[PDB]
Structure formats: C-alpha cells, structure tokens
C-alpha cells in the first residue's frame, strides 16, 4: 500500500567515501522508517530504526535523516565490509512494506583474475557427459570476458558462467566458467583453451590442455 | 542468548500446504512486548513481510495473502508456526522468521537465517560429486586450485564445505545455474599452498537435505 522507492538501485564508490542513499514514501510515514543490511546469503541485519536512530550493535559511521515523505541513509567511510544491499522499511502502519534495495559495490585496485582449468574427471565420462571447467580468481573490476576453444575453433551455447558476490574482506569477484560437451564429442577433439580478457591483462591470457595426458 | 531457526529446506508441490516452524530461544513467547513475524525473498527479489504475532495472540497478515496465511504460537514449545495454503510456483522463496525490536512498531531485531522453499511438481535428487583435482594447470606459481564439482541435483540448496568446516579461505562457492534437466549445478573451489598437495588431505563435504543425501569427497592430484 504504502510505496518506498529506493534511489539510486546500484552505487560503486571507494573504500573511505560517504555512500547517500534515498528512500521514498508515497505517502507520510513521520519518523517511522528502518534501514537494513543484507550480505549475500544472510539474514538482513538492522542497521537505523525511527529515521535516524542508531540500533545495538552497528558502527556510528551509519546514520539516517528525514522524516515524512523522504529519507536518506549515509554510510561515511567505506570499507570492504560495506558491500551489500540495503532496503529501507516503513514501520508506521498496516501493511508493513519495504523498498526494492539498493546495491552498494566498493571499489578497489584493478586485480588480474589468477585462472586455472580443470579437465574432465574420468568419472564423470563413464556417465557420458563431460564438464571442463575455466576459474577466474579473485579479480576486479567484475568485467571479464571468457572464450572457449576446442581445436583452435570457437564455441556457442555449450558454455555457463557463474560469479560469486563480491568479497568482503578483499573486494574481488571469482567466476566459473563451465563448457559441457557429450562424453562422444569430448574425446572427438585434442586441444582444450580457455582465453580470458580482462582490464587487469595487458593481453588476453589462455589456459589449456591435450585431452587425457 | 537470542537465537531464531526456521524449520529446515522444504519441497513444496503446487496447490499443497506449506508448514514451517520457527524456533526460539533467548527470550519467552509470552513475555510482555515479545513478538514474531515472518518475511520472505524471492530469488534476487525485494523482502516481503508476510505475518507477525505477539506475546498476547493478537496476530497480523499481509492483506495481499491473508486468505492463505495462518500464524501461531506455542510457549512451553518455543516454536511459532507458519500455514501457508495453496502454494504457488511464485512463492518460491527464502523465509525468515524474525523478533520485532520493539513492543509496538513493526520493524526486525533478530533474525533466523531463512529456509529456501522450492514450489515445483518436479521431485528431490541428490547430487553427484565430481573432483576438479589440482594439476600444472591449476598450480601458477607456489598456489594450486581444487574443487568439487556438485552436480544435477534438486531442489536447491546444497551446502558445501572443505574438509568438515577447518577449511574456508580462499574457498570459492558459486551459485548454482538451473540446467536444460532442469537440475542445478555449481563447482565449489579452493586455493591452497603448492607444497601440502603431497600432505594435506583435501575433502568435499556435500550436504543436500532435501534428498536427505549428504557425500564427501576426497580431491587429489591426478
């Protein structure tokens, strides 16, 4: 009923800046309004309660304003920590309603993804599928763009990629990359690469290996 | 202290009931001002508050929902519980059950860690639990990477952990992608020194409580 309207609904900002983040109501809610955090898979964790009041257990470099129609959180020097989403909540009348988040990323120094493959393992060939497997490590920022090679040729559609939510301690994103062939086109084909661009590589690096060996 | 559990992953087929409990402790489910909500999250959704009951029994629904919903309490058990009807493919999601912070606003103090709930017709399989062992390929340089690669199970999630919970850094857990099966997969990886791959022991452990499967797996060089 009441609509909270977060603003802006993503923020990239660097580790000791002040992040500003607004909420909306469509209607007056006084002071009544609460801010959370939620890591990745985690519960939300409270952060302000009544607008501008501070809860047990967070640090004063959070704080709340507003009142009525608007109200804004600041987080005043970013840490690695500070990654999240963060949702505001109305808690002024029936029914209890909260906004869409905005998503906090902290910047960091642009790290190289460290990569690594992996062949299929023998026992997942006796079932007749094959999973090869590119790692990107630990790089930033989250922009990478991988390309598998069977035999020098490009392939489409027979790869998945996957990307963990960014670090809390160092800032960095992984990524997997997974190409699924049949077992019969696997050992069909010798030379298995995995070229990686990424802003941190003066020049795309490769990962490969001859099948078996 | 103050601690809440939700009643664990459940499979729920569309049209049927969902039941979920919350447990509590730290605190007693009749003392003046104690209450308890539930919320929910759809996948890479917004929070929704669905419910919430205090220490007298006076009880509160989403209006949205209120002609599926049904929330109660039990003291002397220390559970609150959640009666959902008519589930949905729609309502699936993570639920939280939650402590107000107050005794009249409605806002969240505590929080239990949620319970993915799947609606789907489709039935449990445990996963199968493949090595990505360490090589020349995964060794640049004094770090060698590892993993397990989890594969084709349902519904989500599976919780995966090196060598019984005494491994956790640098250890890298993605989120599942939902296969044309229509079964999820992930690889769970590792990074660890070069010179204890002749040493060290390195363990998977896959637990996938919906099937009730849980395996471990041994990851080595070869």
């Known amino acids: 009923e009441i609509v909270l309207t977060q603003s802006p609904a993503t923020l990239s900002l660097s580790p000791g800046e002040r992040a500003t983040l607004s909420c909306r109501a469509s209607?007056?809610?006084?002071?009544?309004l609460a801010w959370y955090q939620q890591k990745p898979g985690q519960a939300p964790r409270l952060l302000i309660y009544?607008?501008?009041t501070l809860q047990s257990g967070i640090p004063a470099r959070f704080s709340g304003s507003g009142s009525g129609t608007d109200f804004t959180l600041t987080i005043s020097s970013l840490e690695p920590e500070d990654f999240a989403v963060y949702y505001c909540q109305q808690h002024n009348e029936y029914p209890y309603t909260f906004g869409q988040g905005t998503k906090l990323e902290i910047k960091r120094t642009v790290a190289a993804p460290s990569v690594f493959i992996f062949p299929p393992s023998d026992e997942q060939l006796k079932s007749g599928t094959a999973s090869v497997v590119c790692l990107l490590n630990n790089f930033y920022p989250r922009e990478a763009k991988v390309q598998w090679k069977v035999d020098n040729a490009l392939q489409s559609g027979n790869s998945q990629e996957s990307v963990t939510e960014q670090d809390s301690k160092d800032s960095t994103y992984s990524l997997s990359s997974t190409l699924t062939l049949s077992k019969a086109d696997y050992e069909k084909h010798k030379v298995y690469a995995c070229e990686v661009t990424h802003q941190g590589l003066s020049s795309p690096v490769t990962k490969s290996f001859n099948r078996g060996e | 202290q103050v601690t809440l559990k939700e009643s664990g992953p459940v499979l729920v087929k569309p049209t049927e009931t969902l039941t979920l409990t919350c447990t509590v402790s730290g605190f007693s489910l009749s003392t003046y001002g104690m209450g308890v909500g539930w919320i929910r999250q759809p996948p890479g959704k917004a929070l929704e508050w669905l419910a919430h009951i205090w220490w007298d029994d006076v009880k509160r629904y989403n209006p949205a929902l209120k002609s599926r919903l049904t929330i109660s309490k039990d003291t002397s058990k220390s559970q609150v519980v959640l009666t959902m009807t008519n589930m949905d493919p729609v309502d699936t999601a993570t639920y939280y059950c939650?402590?107000?912070?107050?005794?009249?606003?409605?806002?969240?103090?505590?929080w239990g860690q949620g319970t993915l709930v799947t609606v789907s017709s489709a039935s449990t399989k445990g996963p199968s639990v493949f090595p990505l062992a360490p090589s020349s390929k995964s060794t640049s340089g004094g770090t060698a990477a590892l993993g397990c690669l989890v594969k084709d199970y349902f519904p989500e999630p599976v919780t995966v952990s090196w060598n019984s919970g005494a491994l956790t850094s640098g250890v890298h857990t993605f989120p599942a992608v939902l296969q044309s099966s229509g079964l999820y997969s992930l690889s769970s990886v590792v990074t660890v020194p070069s010179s204890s791959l002749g040493t060290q022991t390195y363990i998977c452990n896959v637990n996938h409580k919906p099937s009730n499967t849980k395996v471990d797996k041994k990851v080595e060089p070869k």
């Open positions: 209607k007056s809610i006084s002071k009544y």
């Open positions: 939650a402590r107000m912070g107050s005794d009249y606003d409605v806002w969240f103090d505590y």
């Open positions: 009544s607008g501008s």
